[PDB]
Write a protein that binds this ligand. Sequence first.
Ligand SMILES: CCCCCCCCCCCCCC(=O)O
Lengths: 15, 17, 16, 17, 17, 238, 238, 60, 222, 221, 52, 249
Amino acid sequence: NINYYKDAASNSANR
Amino acid sequence: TNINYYKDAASNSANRQ
Amino acid sequence: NINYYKDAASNSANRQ
Amino acid sequence: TNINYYKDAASNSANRQ
Amino acid sequence: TNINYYKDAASNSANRQ
Amino acid sequence: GLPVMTTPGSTQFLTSDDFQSPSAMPQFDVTPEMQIPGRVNNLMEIAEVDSVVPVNNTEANVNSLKAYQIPVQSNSDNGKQVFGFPLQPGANGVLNRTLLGEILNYYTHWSGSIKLTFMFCGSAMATGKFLLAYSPPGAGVPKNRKDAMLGTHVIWDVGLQSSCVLCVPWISQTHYRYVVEDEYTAAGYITCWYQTNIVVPADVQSSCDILCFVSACNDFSVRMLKDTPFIRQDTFYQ
Amino acid sequence: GLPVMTTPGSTQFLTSDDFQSPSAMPQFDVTPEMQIPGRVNNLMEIAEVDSVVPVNNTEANVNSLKAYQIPVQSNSDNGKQVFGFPLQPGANGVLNRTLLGEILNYYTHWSGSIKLTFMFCGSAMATGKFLLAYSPPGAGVPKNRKDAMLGTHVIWDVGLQSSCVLCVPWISQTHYRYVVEDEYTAAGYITCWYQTNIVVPADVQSSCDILCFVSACNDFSVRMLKDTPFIRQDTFYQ
Amino acid sequence: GLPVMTTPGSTQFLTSDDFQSPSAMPQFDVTPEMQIPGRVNNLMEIAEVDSVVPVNNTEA
Amino acid sequence: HSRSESSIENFLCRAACVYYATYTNNSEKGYAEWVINTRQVAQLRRKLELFTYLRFDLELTFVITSAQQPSTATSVDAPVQTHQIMYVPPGGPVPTKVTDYAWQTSTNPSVFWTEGNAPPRMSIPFISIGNAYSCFYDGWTQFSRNGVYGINTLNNMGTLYMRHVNEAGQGPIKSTVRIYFKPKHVKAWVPRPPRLCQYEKQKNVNFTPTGVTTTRVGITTT
Amino acid sequence: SRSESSIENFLCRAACVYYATYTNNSEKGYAEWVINTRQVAQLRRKLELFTYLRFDLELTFVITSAQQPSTATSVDAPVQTHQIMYVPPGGPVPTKVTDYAWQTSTNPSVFWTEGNAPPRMSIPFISIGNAYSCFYDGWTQFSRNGVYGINTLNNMGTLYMRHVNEAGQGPIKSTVRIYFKPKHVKAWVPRPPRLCQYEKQKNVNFTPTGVTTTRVGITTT
Amino acid sequence: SAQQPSTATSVDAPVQTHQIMYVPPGGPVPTKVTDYAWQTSTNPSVFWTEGN
Amino acid sequence: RSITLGNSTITTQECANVVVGYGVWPEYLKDNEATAEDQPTQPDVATCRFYTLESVQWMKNSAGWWWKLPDALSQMGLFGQNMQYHYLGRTGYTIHVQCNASKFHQGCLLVVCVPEAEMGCSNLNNTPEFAELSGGDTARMFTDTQIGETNSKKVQTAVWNAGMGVGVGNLTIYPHQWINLRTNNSATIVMPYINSVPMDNMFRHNNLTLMIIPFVPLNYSEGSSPYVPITVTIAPMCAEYNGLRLASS
Ligand SMILES: CCCCCCCCCCCCCC(=O)O
């Protein structure tokens, strides 16, 4: 799982 | 090449092989 | 080359 | 992500880090 | 970080770098 | 121009999707965190908490604390049912509005054991014994103590232990049961009977009350998230 | 903004596509698995199962068990073909409704050998001999036992072998054959003849019956999935 | 949600394009191959074969 | 050589229309509803009924198409139409009108899809209470061996509602939603004879007896 | 497992929190909404199961337009584009369809054309305290007067909506539906679920209801 | 597709979707626009919306 | 040889071969697959024994017979008693269909065990009656012809569709044997527990249905004894009962 955005709010749910 | 994008197993493609 | 589909018929032409 | 698709530096994202 | 997706050289980007 | 092929499901807003979205307040310094007491991590943490059961759902008691009071008295007979409700934690009115029932109504399936704690709120001088029985489905609700005795039951002496826990096990054909009533996912009947009449001394009131509490056991889970029927709206509140 | 170019086939719903789709019930704890008997992994596992053949398709017999009964009787003659059907497992009425034929009707191509098991259900005292022959196409249906005897044939003595299995071989110009009738992909004719008349003693019945069973051999396969012509609808069943 | 930008030429059907496409008949067991004589690999293999020339094109 | 295409996965893993319903633009109560069963259509039902017990995930594809209905206004302009498909699991609140609170889908999953785009698709897990879906049930719903007899004592999969999110258009538009099921990751047990007699009712096996097969003249006929 | 009964899964589902209308006609054809989570019943109750929460948000907008009556011949309207502007507390407020505020030099805003995927936009935990407050047993003024309730804490700004394209010969009415989806959730201090139906968006005010549904006798099975 | 001549007023046609079904030799054959065969439980078929 | 189980020891044996269901020998429920948390009752000998049901007569016209399994042994002994007293049950079976004729007789029976034999009605707008589907120790019979529509709650017993809308000639997919009187005297099928759930109620759900259908009719010359009976003997195997309580039929 790689996140593309600099802000934590942009991430998917914590599942 | 087959990578699964979703956190849930039900979201995967069929077991064709 | 990278193939996205499980069936060989889905691949591009054999030009190389 | 650590990438840039365009040959000119002005095309890149903001310096927010 | 740019790769070529097409089998023919005419499909490539311009010679800018 | 990377070659791409769009698949079905594009342009789709699925309420229960889990995609990333670009932030509207980049670099927003969130106020730091504080260790606030009572952090909840799972709704079963709530479902495992005892909550009072309105066994006496009588229309007159429902709008009062009397709904939670199970009357008991010194009687001349033997083997008189004290109360009886079906094992519908999410459907029957006795349990549907308990804490456990409220949580269950947000889900479709449920599975697990149930703790029914009974507390005798009578005088310190009163004595007596009761039969707390769980009768699986298939046979009707036990009509007499003899019938109730053939199933899972407990002898509770109120004098010895003012509180008593009856732990209803999970006895089902399937791994789960419908929160809503289905004669397929039948659950059982819970009854209480006089094992030995309430004996009281002189100058003590012979009529007392008992309180019922419901919680879930360590082997309890719910599934298939859904909306509760309890909350309804006609126009935006203002 | 990664550069991308959508190719033809975008926004396309092909019935037989195999793309990944977002789940509507995230984190659903599936009910565990159970070892239920009779696991099926391939439909050829079913096509390999013997099922009774309605060789006697006669209008009057088809609506009764008499269709599955092949009449045999004590005779004054020889040769005397007992039955004959073409080798169309998926087309002809003799076979298309068998287990094997039902499976073949969901596919377009088929290839392999076929097990024709014949069981004699006469009296324990009856004896006889039959010629089970598979005549490949090219020549008309064998008219006499002499003609049928040239092609693949088997002498079945009723008495030592109550049952006899004929494995019709795969003799075809092509690797596969059409499940539907085509004079190109011809399969042949299966005939049976009297090799030695049914001899019976006194005071036991001289006319007996035979049952026919069809299955697939170890080298049988089907191809090009399709819809069966057998099921039809004109409105939503309710 | 991977950021993407569609470039010119999308949703375009070029007769002479060479993209991969999803198969409509998954897992289809093709009939095996046979060594048929006279396999052609290039049309020059045909063009290199002598053929009679109609030098006397006279109408009649 | 290979029996690959005859695997259960290949056999059942092809989309199939299980039902389709209609709703209207403004109407009054122009919402649609469907109790989810797999027995209303013949093709998919027979394929599934070749087995007694099944277990699989599902790929849901919705094909929603609208059409202009007659009107009396001069040049009605259609703005793009959006639709909402809501799933009400058994026990949840149910929409009684196009403007009900249930449509808020705080918990109930639902899709919002605008016309002219790729058909919406959703995968869903194995939603059964038992360790396998049951194709047939030789029993009743009540322990008194009374009430209901058959598979409709088991079927409890919730309802599926359909509505236009767009509305009030000066001209009426009627829409048709078509639900498509595609079993993924399939597991089957206990095969049983293919259905012979035409299906009659979705809630029971009831059939009108028919002959074993087609007829020929003589046993030697070719 | 209890996977689907986690707080993340319980709350992490889109929910319509409010929807309003705006038209192509007039110059007051913009819509506005003060951002609260108490106008809608379902999500409000889900959140009120706890006293203090903390989470990010996934905002998805479902914008649908509709032809309104007109008397002109041949109404061929082109695609409609919309602007959604967020005005934090203290910013300038659009007073008309053609105000300067819509420049959004600073105020974030979404420009979305009809017929495409609904616009989506995530936002972090934007509270002043170390957690969102679902209840407030206090006042807004130190004099124990003025306002009483959670409407002394709610100060999350306003949201304005408008058509970017210019009207033609036929009016167009549009309805925006705002959807909240709490991501990365942390909850504290659970409390009894709401029993009486909601009456007001700015306070707990209720009209008393019975504890449960009724049966006849304690033995009624 | 093409709009064909019509007699009523204000043809406000919504987006048009089409189905392409393959009936292998021997399969059921559509006899009407609304036949059961269009379910394509087994028969491959594509559903495609105009403008893509 | 013999097959001895729980005080009962049928001997019908001649090399031959027992058809073991779907390749699975009945076993008790594993702790891995169970959900009922109460400890089961395993009567063993008292229950797992050969109960011989009522015999039926094979006639030259007989179309066939069927039994629903739980409600065939429902009234037979301690199996039935535990069945009445418990909410949940789980059993395998050993089914032994015994038929003997003489060398001068002829005929052939199909003995099949259909799991989940849901049966249809003659009036398509209702389901058959409990008594129509069930016969306690009393085999219910198939019919030689289609039964009438007018019949409100009857089972469509036309044999060539097996009451399930299928091809009777394809019932061989279910575990089965043939009793060919020419070469056969009995049929033995060892069936395991077939169900989607680990345990189920034994009155509400008849997990299995035995069917005996003569495919080649009985015949014999004048003089050979004309009364050929068929006797069914079924034995529960690895019986388990959960959820003890009051009892009721
Ligand atoms: C949904 C996809 C269905 C497509 C099936 C079409 C199959 C036709 C193959 C063409 C064979 C060419 C034969 C030839 O002319 O040499």
